[PDB]
RNA sequence: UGUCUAAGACAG
RNA sequence: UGUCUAAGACAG
RNA sequence: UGUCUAAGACA
RNA sequence: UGUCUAAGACA
């Protein structure tokens, strides 16, 4: 209905939340960044296109800063040591109804819900065991 | 512990939930599938690799099917009308602390939380505008 | 005396039990078939032969059908939607005594006993994990 | 959760029981080995793979040794006089539900249940008659 | 019996011990890491395979962090300056009984017991003299 | 001081102990052997090298034999039925403090301490699961 | 790197 | 990198 | 589809 | 040693 708005990316219960806001719409790709230097910010981008005859495809990217021992506003090199990148690609058949899509979103939420396998592994620098 | 446990992939309040369970770990790829014919099952796979000398990369995949009954050769078989695919690559630097990773997980959770931009667009067959 | 008798292949309480009976013994190959439409029957075959100077070799095979009705042109027939195939080869040296053989059989029964790894993986459309 | 655990391969009351434990899982091939001299150990291996578009295939193997002492040049070693080899292939279509699989397993257990044809022939160094 | 559990790697008498816990079981290789960023953690991995016809071989690896002047959670480069690596390879003939193996373990313990030559040399940045 | 001293490699409480002593230091490789015929002796060797411009590498080896009496040409000779080999490479950065090294030694000691995962698996001819 | 018959070897 | 019929693929 | 010393092989 | 429609097959 007009969803390109600011939102809470990292929720720490009001006090200490990381908020992300619209920062670019070039080429139809929506971008959101936290209030930092681009080298230390949280960034989120998203776009959809019909990847093929039968499928539509969402491409979502997220960049999370390494905070431990960080120096706010400083020049931290090498860049690859201070940043994590998430790249999501959601392929959805053109036959999926709004309902079908609502379930796909739920599957994604369940996948990452706190306490489940995957998020528990990532959050502990671990694999599956 | 052991993080290789079953979990509810799609939550619909107790009943109607889509729960998925450990099914394979061959070749270092942890697999979870729902209780159905291998042809109609929901599937989730996860794996971690030391992608670089200073990087670790998680590869996660989810397969949400649209079940159906197809008649092949006059006989009916349990099949999937089509499948939706979620593929995410997560690259975390080896210098990332546990708290640093907890931050990445929170970000992904925040990203897909009901009400926020992206999950809203996806659930309505729409882009961000 | 005879061991080419009918037996219970699948036990489901008292009723719902699949029984298979002797049907053919051509070429030293014993064959058992469940009743009714040969097309939807369970099949078991067995044979032994001196595979070499010091070895005897058993060849056991089992076919479990997926009962169904095929309709083509309005004509319907009792068929098997598909079949699951089991084939085992058992090599036993000529030095094995009756005791040694009784042990080999216990090993086979243990391998498929309820609760153990292999039978549990199969019954859940899974592998080892 | 895990099904790559140790189990009782041969049951002989409470004592005299052969137990086999996880030892290796390279190349998607699960392997169990009984304790003591690897040379006189029982071995079990298992694996699954998509054998075709509509079929998955299991490969189970078991080795039962004939414990003995080899003496050569006055030096003696724990060896296996000989080994009995079991090898089974199980093909299951992707349309099989959990129920269908549970049935296939019951068929296998029935095939080797005490008293029935096949297990009795094997345990008596015999064929069908 | 089920040994993949957490244990004390560096014992400093309760207070100040370094504990290591299961963190991965991909490919059958057991991994244990301390609670740190992977760049600063203690890591232990282990696996066994039959290296040849007559031998089994254990491969054990350990990574110990350089702690003096360390900055917890910081990005320390070059990696090679802040880490020590131990790589053990234990070859055992298939004729070794549990007893034989128990003695091999004792030999390893004696080799590293406090006060003996080897550990005394390593602990003093020395060679043998 | 002089760290080149004899020590008890295998401890069995005063009596039955396997003690090994300095035997050679030719070519910079310190050797210790038990008091037996060179053919049945336990052997331990150690050496240190400045492997890199910023690294030092220790190479340690232990040979545990299985003594036996073989009859060759009608005559009996003291021999080893087989040998077990332990080979470990330890790489420590030149920036490692004495306390840093004491940490590495403690880790290796903790690794092989009775009751812990690895020594337990080894002593039982088993893997970690 | 990996393997062994093991401070010397072999197949990268 | 991208795509799919999806841990395996194809066109860089 | 088969054999052996068996996840490697040999036809 | 392997695949399938399975005691017949196909490499």
Coordinates of C-alpha atoms in Angstrom, one line a residue, chain E residues 1-12 25 28 30 32 42 44-46 48 55-56 58 60 62 64-68 78 80-93 95-98 100-114 116-129, chain F residues 1-12 18 25 30 32 42 44-48 54-56 58 60-62 64-66 82-114 116-129:
Chain E
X1 CA 29.1 -45.1 24.4
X2 CA 28.4 -41.5 23.3
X3 CA 31.5 -39.5 23.8
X4 CA 30.8 -36.3 21.8
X5 CA 30.5 -34.0 24.9
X6 CA 31.9 -30.8 26.3
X7 CA 35.1 -31.1 28.3
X8 CA 37.9 -29.1 30.0
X9 CA 40.7 -28.5 27.5
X10 CA 42.8 -26.2 29.7
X11 CA 42.6 -26.9 33.4
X12 CA 43.6 -24.2 35.8
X25 CA 29.6 -32.9 13.2
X28 CA 31.6 -37.2 10.8
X30 CA 33.7 -34.0 15.5
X32 CA 34.7 -28.5 19.7
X42 CA 40.4 -22.9 21.2
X44 CA 39.6 -29.3 18.7
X45 CA 38.6 -31.7 15.8
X46 CA 38.8 -35.5 15.6
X48 CA 39.1 -42.0 12.4
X55 CA 45.9 -49.8 9.8
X56 CA 43.3 -47.5 11.2
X58 CA 43.1 -41.1 14.1
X60 CA 43.4 -35.0 15.7
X62 CA 44.0 -28.5 17.9
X64 CA 45.4 -22.7 20.6
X65 CA 45.2 -18.8 20.7
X66 CA 48.1 -16.6 21.7
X67 CA 46.8 -14.8 24.8
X68 CA 49.6 -12.5 25.9
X78 CA 48.2 -11.5 10.7
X80 CA 49.6 -16.6 11.7
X81 CA 51.0 -14.5 14.5
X82 CA 48.1 -15.2 16.9
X83 CA 47.6 -18.9 16.7
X84 CA 49.3 -22.2 17.3
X85 CA 48.4 -25.4 15.5
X86 CA 48.8 -29.0 16.7
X87 CA 48.2 -31.8 14.3
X88 CA 48.3 -35.4 15.6
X89 CA 48.2 -38.6 13.5
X90 CA 47.8 -41.8 15.3
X91 CA 48.2 -45.0 13.3
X92 CA 47.0 -48.2 14.9
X93 CA 47.3 -51.7 13.4
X95 CA 45.2 -56.2 15.4
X96 CA 45.3 -53.9 18.4
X97 CA 42.9 -54.9 21.1
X98 CA 41.2 -52.5 23.5
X100 CA 46.6 -52.5 23.3
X101 CA 44.9 -49.2 22.6
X102 CA 44.7 -48.4 26.3
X103 CA 48.5 -48.7 26.5
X104 CA 48.9 -46.5 23.4
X105 CA 46.8 -43.8 25.2
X106 CA 49.0 -44.1 28.3
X107 CA 52.1 -43.7 26.2
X108 CA 50.6 -40.4 24.9
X109 CA 49.8 -39.2 28.4
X110 CA 53.2 -40.0 29.6
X111 CA 54.8 -38.3 26.7
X112 CA 53.0 -35.0 27.7
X113 CA 52.9 -35.4 31.5
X114 CA 54.1 -32.3 33.3
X116 CA 58.8 -34.6 31.3
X117 CA 61.3 -33.6 28.6
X118 CA 59.0 -32.7 25.6
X119 CA 56.4 -30.6 27.4
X120 CA 59.2 -28.9 29.4
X121 CA 60.9 -27.9 26.2
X122 CA 57.8 -26.6 24.5
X123 CA 56.7 -24.7 27.6
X124 CA 60.1 -22.9 27.6
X125 CA 60.4 -22.0 24.0
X126 CA 63.3 -24.5 23.8
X127 CA 64.6 -27.5 22.0
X128 CA 66.4 -30.4 23.7
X129 CA 69.7 -29.7 25.4
Chain F
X1 CA 69.5 -28.1 33.9
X2 CA 69.3 -30.2 30.7
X3 CA 66.0 -31.4 29.6
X4 CA 67.5 -34.5 27.9
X5 CA 66.5 -36.9 30.6
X6 CA 64.8 -40.3 30.8
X7 CA 61.2 -40.5 31.7
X8 CA 58.4 -43.0 32.2
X9 CA 56.5 -43.2 28.9
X10 CA 53.9 -45.7 30.2
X11 CA 52.9 -45.5 33.8
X12 CA 51.5 -48.6 35.6
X18 CA 57.7 -48.4 30.4
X25 CA 71.0 -36.7 19.3
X30 CA 66.7 -36.2 20.1
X32 CA 64.8 -41.9 23.5
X42 CA 59.6 -48.3 22.4
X44 CA 60.4 -41.4 21.0
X45 CA 62.0 -38.7 18.9
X46 CA 61.8 -34.9 19.0
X47 CA 63.1 -31.9 17.0
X48 CA 62.5 -28.2 16.6
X54 CA 57.9 -16.1 12.0
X55 CA 57.2 -19.7 13.0
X56 CA 58.8 -22.6 14.9
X58 CA 58.1 -29.2 16.7
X60 CA 57.4 -35.4 17.8
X61 CA 57.1 -39.2 17.2
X62 CA 56.4 -42.1 19.4
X64 CA 54.7 -48.3 20.6
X65 CA 55.5 -52.0 19.7
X66 CA 53.7 -55.2 20.2
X82 CA 53.5 -54.7 14.7
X83 CA 54.0 -51.1 15.7
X84 CA 51.7 -48.2 16.4
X85 CA 52.9 -44.8 15.3
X86 CA 52.1 -41.3 16.8
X87 CA 53.3 -38.3 14.8
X88 CA 52.6 -34.8 15.9
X89 CA 53.5 -31.5 14.3
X90 CA 53.3 -28.4 16.6
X91 CA 53.5 -24.9 15.0
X92 CA 54.0 -22.0 17.4
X93 CA 54.4 -18.4 16.4
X94 CA 57.7 -16.6 17.5
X95 CA 55.5 -14.1 19.2
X96 CA 54.4 -16.7 21.7
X97 CA 55.3 -15.9 25.3
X98 CA 56.4 -18.6 27.8
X99 CA 53.0 -18.4 29.4
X100 CA 51.5 -18.7 25.9
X101 CA 53.4 -22.0 25.4
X102 CA 52.5 -23.3 28.9
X103 CA 48.9 -22.8 27.6
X104 CA 49.6 -25.1 24.6
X105 CA 51.0 -27.8 26.8
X106 CA 48.1 -27.7 29.2
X107 CA 45.7 -28.0 26.2
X108 CA 47.5 -31.1 25.0
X109 CA 47.4 -32.6 28.5
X110 CA 43.8 -31.8 28.8
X111 CA 43.1 -33.3 25.4
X112 CA 44.4 -36.7 26.5
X113 CA 43.3 -36.8 30.1
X114 CA 41.5 -40.0 31.2
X116 CA 37.7 -37.1 28.2
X117 CA 36.2 -37.8 24.7
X118 CA 39.3 -38.6 22.5
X119 CA 41.3 -40.8 24.8
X120 CA 38.1 -42.7 25.6
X121 CA 37.3 -43.3 21.9
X122 CA 40.9 -44.4 21.1
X123 CA 41.0 -46.8 24.1
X124 CA 37.8 -48.5 22.9
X125 CA 38.6 -48.8 19.2
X126 CA 35.8 -46.2 18.4
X127 CA 35.1 -42.9 16.8
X128 CA 33.5 -39.8 18.4
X129 CA 29.7 -39.9 18.2

